[PDB]
């Protein structure tokens, strides 16, 4: 749709170390989270995610999603059923995959939570509160999602 070989290689070159170029290209083409041996500093994968999003979606900024919104995914597990945990994990993976645009992630998350609409609305509310300046980790969903 928007991802090209040129764009992915450029993002990898601008954001990943020389030895991790291939790995960065791989997680972008497969649409997965950044691993790549960024072990010494656990905060680095997060910064690489932001760098990659900024290069891949430079022309279409609305396709980006703040990395912090991935914490909102925990709400899907409140559906104490296997499908709830499955959607929660799917959400966490999607929300930490830098090359997957917003619409694609949200369509998949909305689809797995179709029989739990209340939880999807809470997920969206959590994202709005994060955008509004609330460090969401401070509040449990029960505090701003009353259902």
């Amino acid at each position: 749709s928007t991802l090209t070989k040129e764009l992915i290689k450029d993002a990898a070159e601008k954001c990943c170390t020389r030895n991790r170029q291939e790995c960065c290209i791989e997680i972008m083409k497969f649409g997965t989270p950044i691993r790549c041996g960024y072990d010494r500093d656990p905060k680095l994968p997060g910064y690489v995610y932001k760098c990659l999003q900024n290069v891949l979606f430079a022309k279409e900024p609305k396709k980006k999603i703040n990395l912090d919104d991935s914490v909102c995914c925990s709400v899907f597990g409140n559906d104490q059923e296997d499908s709830g945990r499955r959607c929660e994990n799917r959400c966490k993976n999607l929300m930490t995959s830098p090359s997957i645009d917003a619409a694609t992630r949200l369509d998949s998350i909305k689809s797995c939570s179709l029989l739990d609409n209340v939880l999807y609305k809470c997920f969206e509310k959590c994202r709005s509160l994060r955008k509004d300046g609330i460090k969401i980790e401070v509040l449990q969903f029960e505090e701003y999602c009353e259902a």
Side-chain angles (χ1 to χ4, degrees):
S1 61
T2 183
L3 298 186
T4 63
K5 181 178 183 297
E6 295 68 45
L7 198 56
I8 288 173
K9 290 187 66 170
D10 186 54
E13 295 157 18
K14 294 177 173 177
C15 306
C16 306
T17 62
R18 301 290 180 179
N19 69 308
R20 296 181 177 88
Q21 292 294 298
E22 283 282 61
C23 182
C24 281
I25 288 166
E26 287 244 312
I27 68 89
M28 284 185 272
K29 80 185 197 185
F30 282 110
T32 61
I34 299 161
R35 292 190 175 178
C36 306
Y38 276 116
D39 303 307
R40 186 181 246 186
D41 189 337
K43 292 184 176 186
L44 191 49
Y47 299 136
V48 175
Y49 167 101
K50 297 179 177 183
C51 183
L52 294 175
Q53 287 238 305
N54 283 180
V55 178
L56 296 175
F57 299 121
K59 291 195 174 178
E60 312 186 81
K62 296 294 191 172
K63 293 190 173 174
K64 300 192 288 193
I65 289 173
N66 195 113
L67 183 60
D68 298 320
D69 290 4
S70 62
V71 306
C72 300
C73 291
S74 295
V75 76
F76 293 111
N78 284 303
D79 180 309
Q80 299 298 1
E81 301 178 356
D82 300 323
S83 66
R85 179 164 177 288
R86 186 178 187 191
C87 189
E88 169 177 3
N89 291 331
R90 157 85 54 95
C91 184
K92 292 178 173 178
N93 283 326
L94 289 164
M95 297 288 283
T96 53
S97 294
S99 66
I100 304 179
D101 62 53
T104 297
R105 302 181 184 187
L106 296 175
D107 289 338
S108 177
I109 293 162
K110 185 172 183 177
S111 289
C112 58
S113 59
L114 281 175
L115 301 188
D116 298 301
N117 181 58
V118 174
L119 299 186
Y120 182 71
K121 290 183 177 176
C122 181
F123 168 76
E124 289 282 64
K125 181 168 194 175
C126 177
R127 292 185 65 218
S128 289
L129 283 182
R130 197 285 311 156
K131 171 79 169 184
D132 289 346
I134 303 296
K135 174 182 187 302
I136 47 185
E137 305 96 317
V138 172
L139 301 176
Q140 35 184 48
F141 305 105
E142 301 90 0
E143 294 196 68
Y144 57 93
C145 297
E146 301 186 2

